[PDB]
Amino acid sequence: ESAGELLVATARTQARGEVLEEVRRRVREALEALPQKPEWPEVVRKLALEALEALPGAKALVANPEDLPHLEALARERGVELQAEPALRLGVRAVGAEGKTQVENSLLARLDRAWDALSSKVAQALWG
Amino acid sequence: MIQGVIQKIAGPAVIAKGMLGARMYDICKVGEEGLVGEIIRLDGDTAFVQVYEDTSGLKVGEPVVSTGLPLAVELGPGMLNGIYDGIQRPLERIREKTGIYITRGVVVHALDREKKWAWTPMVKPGDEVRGGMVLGTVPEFGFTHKILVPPDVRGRVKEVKPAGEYTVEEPVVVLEDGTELKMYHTWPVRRARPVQRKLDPNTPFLTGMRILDVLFPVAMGGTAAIPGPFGAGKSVTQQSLAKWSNADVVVYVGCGERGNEMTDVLVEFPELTDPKTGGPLMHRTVLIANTSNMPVAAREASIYVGVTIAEYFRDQGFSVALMADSTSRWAEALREISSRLEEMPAEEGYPPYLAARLAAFYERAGKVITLGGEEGAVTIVGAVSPPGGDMSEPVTQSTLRIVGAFWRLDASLAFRRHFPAINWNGSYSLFTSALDPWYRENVAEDYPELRDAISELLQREAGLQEIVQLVGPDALQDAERLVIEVGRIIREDFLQQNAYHEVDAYCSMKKAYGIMKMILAFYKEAEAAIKRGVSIDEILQLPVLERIGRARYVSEEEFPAYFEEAMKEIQGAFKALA
Amino acid sequence: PVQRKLDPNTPFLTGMRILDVLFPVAMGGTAAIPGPFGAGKSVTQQSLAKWSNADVVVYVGCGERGNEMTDVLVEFPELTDPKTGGPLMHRTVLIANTSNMPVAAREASIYVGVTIAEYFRDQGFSVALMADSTSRWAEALREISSRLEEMPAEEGYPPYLAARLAAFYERAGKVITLGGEEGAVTIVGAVSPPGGDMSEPVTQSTLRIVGAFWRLDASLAFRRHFPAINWNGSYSLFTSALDPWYRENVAEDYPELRDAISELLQREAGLQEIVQLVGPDALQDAERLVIEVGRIIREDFLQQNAYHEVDAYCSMKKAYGIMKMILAFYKEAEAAIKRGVSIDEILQLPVLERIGRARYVSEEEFPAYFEEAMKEIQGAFKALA
Amino acid sequence: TEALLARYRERAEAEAKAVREKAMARLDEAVALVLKEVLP
Amino acid sequence: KKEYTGITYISGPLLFVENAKDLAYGAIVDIKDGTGRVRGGQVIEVSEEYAVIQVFEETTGLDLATTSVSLVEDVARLGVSKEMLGRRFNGIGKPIDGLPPITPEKRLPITGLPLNPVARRKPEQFIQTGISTIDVMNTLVRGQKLPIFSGSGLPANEIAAQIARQATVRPDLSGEGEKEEPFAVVFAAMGITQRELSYFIQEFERTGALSRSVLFLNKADDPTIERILTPRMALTVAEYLAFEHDYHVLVILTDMTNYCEALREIGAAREEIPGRRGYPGYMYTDLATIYERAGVVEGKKGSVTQIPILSMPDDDRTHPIPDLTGYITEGQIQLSRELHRKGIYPPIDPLPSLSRLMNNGVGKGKTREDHKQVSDQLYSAYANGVDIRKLVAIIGEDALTENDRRYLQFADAFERFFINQGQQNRSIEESLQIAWALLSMLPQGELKRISKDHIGKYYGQKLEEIWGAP
Amino acid sequence: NEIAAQIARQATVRPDLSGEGEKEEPFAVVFAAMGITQRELSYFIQEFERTGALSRSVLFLNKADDPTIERILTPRMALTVAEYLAFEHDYHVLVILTDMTNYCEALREIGAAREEIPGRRGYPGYMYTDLATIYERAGVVEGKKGSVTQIPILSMPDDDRTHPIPDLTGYITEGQIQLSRELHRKGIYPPIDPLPSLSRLMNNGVGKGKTREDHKQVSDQLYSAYANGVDIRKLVAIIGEDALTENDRRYLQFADAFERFFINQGQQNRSIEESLQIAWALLSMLPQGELKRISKDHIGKYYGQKLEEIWG
Amino acid sequence: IPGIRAQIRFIQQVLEQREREDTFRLKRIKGKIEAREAEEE
Numbered sequence A: 001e002s003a004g005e006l007l008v009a010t011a012r013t014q015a016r017g018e019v020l021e022e023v024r025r026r027v028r029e030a031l032e033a034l035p036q037k038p039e040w041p042e043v044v045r046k047l048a049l050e051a052l053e054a055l056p057g058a059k060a061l062v063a064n065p066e067d068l069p070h071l072e073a074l075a076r077e078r079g080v081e082l083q084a085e086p087a088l089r090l091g092v093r094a095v096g097a098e099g100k101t102q103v104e105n106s107l108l109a110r111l112d113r114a115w116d117a118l119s120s121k122v123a124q125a126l127w128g
Numbered sequence B: 001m002i003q004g005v006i007q008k009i010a011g012p013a014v015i016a017k018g019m020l021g022a023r024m025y026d027i028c029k030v031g032e033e034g035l036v037g038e039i040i041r042l043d044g045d046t047a048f049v050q051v052y053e054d055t056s057g058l059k060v061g062e063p064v065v066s067t068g069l070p071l072a073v074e075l076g077p078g079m080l081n082g083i084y085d086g087i088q089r090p091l092e093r094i095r096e097k098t099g100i101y102i103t104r105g106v107v108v109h110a111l112d113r114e115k116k117w118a119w120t121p122m123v124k125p126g127d128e129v130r131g132g133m134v135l136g137t138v139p140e141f142g143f144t145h146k147i148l149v150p151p152d153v154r155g156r157v158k159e160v161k162p163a164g165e166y167t168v169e170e171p172v173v174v175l176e177d178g179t180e181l182k183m184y185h186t187w188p189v190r191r192a193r194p195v196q197r198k199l200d201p202n203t204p205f206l207t208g209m210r211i212l213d214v215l216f217p218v219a220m221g222g223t224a225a226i227p228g229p230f231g232a233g234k235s236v237t238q239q240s241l242a243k244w245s246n247a248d249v250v251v252y253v254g255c256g257e258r259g260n261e262m263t264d265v266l267v268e269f270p271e272l273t274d275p276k277t278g279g280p281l282m283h284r285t286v287l288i289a290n291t292s293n294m295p296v297a298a299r300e301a302s303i304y305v306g307v308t309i310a311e312y313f314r315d316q317g318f319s320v321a322l323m324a325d326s327t328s329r330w331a332e333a334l335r336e337i338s339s340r341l342e343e344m345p346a347e348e349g350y351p352p353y354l355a356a357r358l359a360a361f362y363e364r365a366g367k368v369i370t371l372g373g374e375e376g377a378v379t380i381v382g383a384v385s386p387p388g389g390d391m392s393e394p395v396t397q398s399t400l401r402i403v404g405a406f407w408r409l410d411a412s413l414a415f416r417r418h419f420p421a422i423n424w425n426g427s428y429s430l431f432t433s434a435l436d437p438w439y440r441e442n443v444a445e446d447y448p449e450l451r452d453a454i455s456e457l458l459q460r461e462a463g464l465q466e467i468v469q470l471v472g473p474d475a476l477q478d479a480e481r482l483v484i485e486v487g488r489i490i491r492e493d494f495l496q497q498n499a500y501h502e503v504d505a506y507c508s509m510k511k512a513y514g515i516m517k518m519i520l521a522f523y524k525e526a527e528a529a530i531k532r533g534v535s536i537d538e539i540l541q542l543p544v545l546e547r548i549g550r551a552r553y554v555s556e557e558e559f560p561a562y563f564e565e566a567m568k569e570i571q572g573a574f575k576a577l578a
Numbered sequence C: 001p002v003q004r005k006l007d008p009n010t011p012f013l014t015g016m017r018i019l020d021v022l023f024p025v026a027m028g029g030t031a032a033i034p035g036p037f038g039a040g041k042s043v044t045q046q047s048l049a050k051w052s053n054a055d056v057v058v059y060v061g062c063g064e065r066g067n068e069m070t071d072v073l074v075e076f077p078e079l080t081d082p083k084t085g086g087p088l089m090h091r092t093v094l095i096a097n098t099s100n101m102p103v104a105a106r107e108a109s110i111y112v113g114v115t116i117a118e119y120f121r122d123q124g125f126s127v128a129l130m131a132d133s134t135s136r137w138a139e140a141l142r143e144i145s146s147r148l149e150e151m152p153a154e155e156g157y158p159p160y161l162a163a164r165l166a167a168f169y170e171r172a173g174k175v176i177t178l179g180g181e182e183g184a185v186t187i188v189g190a191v192s193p194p195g196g197d198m199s200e201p202v203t204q205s206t207l208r209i210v211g212a213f214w215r216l217d218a219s220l221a222f223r224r225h226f227p228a229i230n231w232n233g234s235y236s237l238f239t240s241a242l243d244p245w246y247r248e249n250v251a252e253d254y255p256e257l258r259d260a261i262s263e264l265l266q267r268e269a270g271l272q273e274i275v276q277l278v279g280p281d282a283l284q285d286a287e288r289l290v291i292e293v294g295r296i297i298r299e300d301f302l303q304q305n306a307y308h309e310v311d312a313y314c315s316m317k318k319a320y321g322i323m324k325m326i327l328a329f330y331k332e333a334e335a336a337i338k339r340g341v342s343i344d345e346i347l348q349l350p351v352l353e354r355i356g357r358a359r360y361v362s363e364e365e366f367p368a369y370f371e372e373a374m375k376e377i378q379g380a381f382k383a384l385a
Numbered sequence D: 001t002e003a004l005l006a007r008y009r010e011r012a013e014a015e016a017k018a019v020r021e022k023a024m025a026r027l028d029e030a031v032a033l034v035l036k037e038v039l040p
Numbered sequence E: 001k002k003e004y005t006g007i008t009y010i011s012g013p014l015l016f017v018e019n020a021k022d023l024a025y026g027a028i029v030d031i032k033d034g035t036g037r038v039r040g041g042q043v044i045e046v047s048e049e050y051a052v053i054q055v056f057e058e059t060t061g062l063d064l065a066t067t068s069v070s071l072v073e074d075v076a077r078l079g080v081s082k083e084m085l086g087r088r089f090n091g092i093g094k095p096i097d098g099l100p101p102i103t104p105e106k107r108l109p110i111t112g113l114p115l116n117p118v119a120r121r122k123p124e125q126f127i128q129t130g131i132s133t134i135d136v137m138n139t140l141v142r143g144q145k146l147p148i149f150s151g152s153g154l155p156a157n158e159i160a161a162q163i164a165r166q167a168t169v170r171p172d173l174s175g176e177g178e179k180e181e182p183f184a185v186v187f188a189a190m191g192i193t194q195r196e197l198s199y200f201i202q203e204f205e206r207t208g209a210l211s212r213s214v215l216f217l218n219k220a221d222d223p224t225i226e227r228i229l230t231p232r233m234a235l236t237v238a239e240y241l242a243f244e245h246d247y248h249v250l251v252i253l254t255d256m257t258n259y260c261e262a263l264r265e266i267g268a269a270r271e272e273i274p275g276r277r278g279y280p281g282y283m284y285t286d287l288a289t290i291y292e293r294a295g296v297v298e299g300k301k302g303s304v305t306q307i308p309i310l311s312m313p314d315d316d317r318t319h320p321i322p323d324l325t326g327y328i329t330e331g332q333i334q335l336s337r338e339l340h341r342k343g344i345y346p347p348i349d350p351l352p353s354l355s356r357l358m359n360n361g362v363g364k365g366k367t368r369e370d371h372k373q374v375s376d377q378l379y380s381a382y383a384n385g386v387d388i389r390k391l392v393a394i395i396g397e398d399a400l401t402e403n404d405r406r407y408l409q410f411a412d413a414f415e416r417f418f419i420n421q422g423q424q425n426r427s428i429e430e431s432l433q434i435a436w437a438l439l440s441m442l443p444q445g446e447l448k449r450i451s452k453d454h455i456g457k458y459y460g461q462k463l464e465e466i467w468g469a470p
Numbered sequence F: 001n002e003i004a005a006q007i008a009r010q011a012t013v014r015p016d017l018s019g020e021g022e023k024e025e026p027f028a029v030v031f032a033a034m035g036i037t038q039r040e041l042s043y044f045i046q047e048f049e050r051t052g053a054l055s056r057s058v059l060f061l062n063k064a065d066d067p068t069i070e071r072i073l074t075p076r077m078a079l080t081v082a083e084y085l086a087f088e089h090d091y092h093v094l095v096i097l098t099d100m101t102n103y104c105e106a107l108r109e110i111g112a113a114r115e116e117i118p119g120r121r122g123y124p125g126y127m128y129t130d131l132a133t134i135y136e137r138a139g140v141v142e143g144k145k146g147s148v149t150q151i152p153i154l155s156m157p158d159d160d161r162t163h164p165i166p167d168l169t170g171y172i173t174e175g176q177i178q179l180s181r182e183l184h185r186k187g188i189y190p191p192i193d194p195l196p197s198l199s200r201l202m203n204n205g206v207g208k209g210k211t212r213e214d215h216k217q218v219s220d221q222l223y224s225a226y227a228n229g230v231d232i233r234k235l236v237a238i239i240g241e242d243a244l245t246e247n248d249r250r251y252l253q254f255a256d257a258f259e260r261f262f263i264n265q266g267q268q269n270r271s272i273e274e275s276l277q278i279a280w281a282l283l284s285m286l287p288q289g290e291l292k293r294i295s296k297d298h299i300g301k302y303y304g305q306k307l308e309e310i311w312g
Numbered sequence G: 001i002p003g004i005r006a007q008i009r010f011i012q013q014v015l016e017q018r019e020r021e022d023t024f025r026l027k028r029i030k031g032k033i034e035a036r037e038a039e040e041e
């Protein structure tokens, strides 16, 4: 008798999973198209500032060649180096003084990092 | 105070740096959470601190602050009626604070700092005071709690607080040198409290049970051991000891028992009523409870806390009874701690210094002259629960070399509906010869000989059990059947005792003396009757037998008349009846 | 990697009556055969290699003696594959690493053999893997760990020995290959505890993961009774799943007969305590009958000679017939004992020799010989009245 | 029988599609909330 | 995203990393190599010079030049919710049933806090398991820790599955307050093989017990630390359900010997000096931290009950594992190899079994009024008949007294009917009827343990197992 | 030592039984001593001189007062010489190693001096491999006429078969000849206990065309009967001899006769046929129906002879 | 029975002594290794 409604439970669980995956892929795509917007130089500053103040005594900084003009004014006054990179798309990375530790701040990484906290809020909003 | 930081975390061990000047075995607080720890090893600017609780989530660099004093307890008013864990933390306040769980780093005070007590000074300004003297009096559940100057404090009194309502914390007496005496002090649990002189134990500890008092007695300030088999009435016997003993104050120690056992002993006691006043029994007791999942250090320090509290109440001039629920669990905790330090195991994993610690703990008991000149005593009863009931185990063997009495419980008699189920074989007491003069002066001049006659009768009954098994009781000689019936009479009328009877739970010495005299008189007259010619089965229906069997269940103030009537019926019954 | 694991529901025919009946092993299951030196592990493994229904056999001789290793290399090219009639070596892969060869090769030979077996399974066959001595591989791990200056766990062994053992044994099982075909790998490994001490850590670790356990007795090996399987100390967890197969391929009452034989053995084992305490003469008539029947089962059914031309292999139906004959004889003996006759008079019946010589009949003559044996058994007691 | 199984599957499908249509009405608000939270 | 490179040492399950002060003791880290594969690890020692990480799985591809380590949690946590019922997990919270991940209501530390002793209350109600040898003679009380002692080849898995399938509460017999509270079963399996995993999955699916239970399954080939963490996850979920949603939870722990051996491997891997018989010296406290998470709490209606299962290694009760378990728990259920070989299931031997809380969960108001007396009489009669079976083999059936023949018949019928119940589910009343039918074979007046009114009410009945006890 | 010397003196092959080969050359003896005392060394020297075999013997002597580390090399040198002779000059070499226990003691000394991790009882972990590097240097090579045969001798400390040295040696070698102190104390020589001993290569050397045909069956029947006799001894230790049946008394008498006649032979040399005749005379004590392991025709051909007839 | 008890006691004592020997050797060698690899560097 219970294995019958077990099908209902599994179907509703997978429906919840499908809609949540829909939300997740939509937000991932939304973060993907952001760099081309002119607001992207306003976000690279925040990301690099937070990363740099998160790592005391950083040596250099890594960013895409496109964002170097936006950070060069910031990096020079912060007293750090700036290096171009084909990778590190829509993200920044700072190395430690010894070079053995790193800090990164990326949208596609922050989403995966905070999805655990945001799942409850998304569920409550969607079915509240 | 000494302050440092953490440089290494590995399990329960924390290695601090910058702690140059800290003292060995002091209490320290680790991290921002302030987890308590104990310094076990010093080297350079590095101290090895042993955390009591779990160390998950700690980080390198978190501050470490040293209290500068070893593990200790707070001694003063407010301890009675209380439930404490291993290191004297009131569990009730913990529940009121953090709910049903015990979170790491809870801070509570042993003595309630808010309750008001009526102060009654006893010293006057200008009087000389010296450690152990009485400063005043506070009422507490019918007890006049005497505030004592700490043992090491000496001087001349400058000011005293007048009578009135004050809290625990308030300074009551200030000495000339500026030292202030309040209603409590603090004392390390691993250092014995000093006394004037230890008086040798010359008076018995009336346990309230006939077998215990008459055949295997323990003197005041003595020690005893008792195994813990299942379904044998150990809990009921300990409960009866607490309820009906001569002791003024009861201290109960649980040192790592199962959750349900601790729940039972914590729920049942508050519903009991001590017979002396009819008030709650919990008013005179202090409960120390420890479950299996508590930190090991608390389970190791529980017995020290209990015995120190008992010694304090002894210094007040009372008599205290102390019970250890299972020294086996305490030995287990000690073995675990010894394994943590990578110490070399001695035998079956127990550290070689087990006997020294056991002797040191058991030696604190005794009848002493307090520093204030009064008299006090502490009686320690320790329970030992070996693995398979094997008494060749090292813990039991070490215990047997220092205790003065051994009460061997067995489940066989409990199955045979005999309560208490204490075997008269294997059990022994070493206080009998020393206690003989007291018995001669107090109960009777021939009481020891009567007890010896009872012992000989029981031994002789046990000395022919083989024919009973081989053949049976009916096919026996007249003397043998008489002896076996005498043994059964003794078992069912003197050793068996019900603790649920309103009048039969407690039995004074004189009642037992009368029972033994009656049984011996009956036995002697029966020997004479057979010598002059009689059949035993004729003697089986003498009314004096049902009189002796009903000699129990009578009031103590009703006893002597019953005793004289029974003696006269014994004398007249064996002559009128063949 | 595979596509999907499956439930083993097909017996692994070994040719040994005691193993095939009392302690079965499924097609994809695992078995362990511990024992002291001289028990008969290697002979049993060679018997499984020679007589089995597996398509391809991989034999891994870790730490094997030299001469015993050449024994196979010489005798196998002469034998015949039961399924196809070709030479036996045409289905066998031998990985040999004797005692005097380097230690780390002795360590890696196990992995090499199991990987080859997995490959042949992914092709779509039924593969049987024989590991000669797992203890001689634990020795290699211990040696290397001691070289590394690692702190051991117990008796010198490294901590990860149990994990390695579980990882090795868990490669067996009937699977669906990536190509959709069926295949299975069966592992039969032997462990040699020091002095037969079954509390040795390798043996205990192996006992926790295997589906079948064939403990070998030193006492039965000393008196030259083989295969010397300790019945009391052995078990098999595949009996339930193989019953539907038995009910269709062998007989409809085969589980009943097997359970009855197991019950009789248990009764004899229980009575053996009294037998030792007071001697067989103090027993009653029925108890003497039970002891005699247990002895008959032990000596004429469980006992098997690996070198005889006919006794070396036994089909399922032969064991079924022998069990049926013994059970019918036992029932007739119960009926006789209830009618007042006494033991040591039944013990000299003529039919006992005909029952004892049953295991030496060829597979072709057995279907009839069993029928006449049953007729003689029925006619003996009733004519005796 | 298979009637109860089929009915349970049908009610499962109805519940699943109802949940999906409920969540499709706030897909956009959920996307807005998560984009607001993740973006510094 | 803070990730550390600069590995200085790799050997066995341990790797050392420098400049890792910020890593908290016990944190879970992720190790990524040059191939992009991700491995798990736990920090076991933190110092100013380096931090020590124990790798969950094998370290085949790691190297000192390309490996990097990143943090996951300062402390292990599990996301819990009431929607966990009906799901399967792999022992660290990762689903293995193919269903989408659940949405956590909260994240909790898996190393739960101890219970305050003054917050506990005495167990008072029983749990119906459906086994006569368990319910009637060794009743299980809500809030108890009653382990099952099994051998090597005995079918402990089948018994566990059957108990999990049949266990239920009985508010009907409560007399007053007759209303049901939701019942859940938490099933944790440690160190199982593929065959056992398949059997458990099929058993929990076919009957429909899955929807009322939560499964934490850890295989034999899985990493050891996962086996260590599994029972703590199960107990965290059980505590959460019972004390937040007023559920009645039954926790089943399988093969505690596997957990002990995993603990031994872990302790040796940390280079700690082993205690007696090779086990760590802190094994007693470690086991206590698992067992002592059961019980009942004042002011709350929920309850947690544990049934540990452990295979005695050499059938020896002096082995440290069963010894410590007997220290901590409140009895044991013993499986008999003789009964198993004789064809009786479940092979529970009543004579060496015991429940230390049975007297408080049976009697008037809780069950039928004559429970304890019937249990005592059955125990005495069976123990009496067992030795007569042995005496018969030497003195013969003919030299028996009339009473001994009755005792023999009672023992045989008891084994055939009471113990050998097969797969069928027996209510407490049906089991009591069977017990009274069996007791009827003994002459009236030999029932010394039973009060006269009970005998008058229930004596005189033939066998109801064949009847099915209507 | 006496058993080893007797074996060396009497060992020979039987070309007539195999039907091939003639007058095989006497075995060459390679003798390696490790920590041998002067008493045993002098006895061995005198025995070899009396048998006249020193002209075919290579001796390596490491006396008990010699340095204890030289014992690492002695068996290796002895086996190098033996292998060279056998596989390059077609000699038939017999190797005798006096005491592997002393070799193990030296190995343990060297290992423990290096702060190695002890395996068990202080012995090094690599002891199995080290011993295998010694024992496994024996056998016969395809295409060559020479051979090497090893007879190591080792002392079990306090007669414990579970000691590491005998345990590993049994796990490496191809059987063992375990002496028993009980038989020695009864005056029986050589005190070989047949039950604990074993030979793993026996089936390759017996049967038709190698020895008499009933060899294996006779061996099996003797094993079964002797084991039954020992069991009846254990039983009569409890229930007394008077309560025994006739079958158990016959088994007991068989065990006594076996121990006193088949094992205890002294220094006399027995051919295979004589040993088989004695075995058959012993087996003829039991009832004919008790000899289950032997086929009926063999019983008809050989069973019936009397034991007292053999001795002249 | 007393003979069996004596044998059991002897065997248990022997096993315990061997376990103690093994533990002592392990701790000694670990201490030496730690000392060399820490103080000497």
Ligand SMILES: Nc1ncnc2c1ncn2[C@@H]1O[C@H](COP(=O)(O)OP(=O)(O)OP(=O)(O)O)[C@@H](O)[C@H]1O
Pocket: B228, B229, B230, B231, B232, B233, B234, B235, B236, B237, B414, B419, B420, B497, B498, B499, B500
């Ligand atoms: N002196 C006694 N007088 C009367 N009843 C007793 C006495 N001692 C034990 N009992 C009986 O035993 C019950 C509980 O004691 P029991 O013998 O079962 O062991 P216990 O005290 O619980 O011991 P443990 O905790 O060591 O198992 C009581 O409720 C009572 O029925």
Ligand SMILES: Nc1ncnc2c1ncn2[C@@H]1O[C@H](COP(=O)(O)OP(=O)(O)O)[C@@H](O)[C@H]1O
Pocket: C035, C036, C037, C038, C039, C040, C041, C042, C043, C044, C226, C227, C304, C305, C306, C307, F199, F200, F201, F202, F203
């Ligand atoms: N079924 C059997 N039939 C005949 N001989 C056997 C049998 N099993 C074992 N043996 C004998 O036992 C001896 C040792 O056998 P082996 O199988 O090599 O033992 P193990 O490998 O267990 O140490 C050999 O002489 C072998 O002939």
Ligand SMILES: [Mg+2]
Pocket: C042
């Ligand atoms: Mg072999």
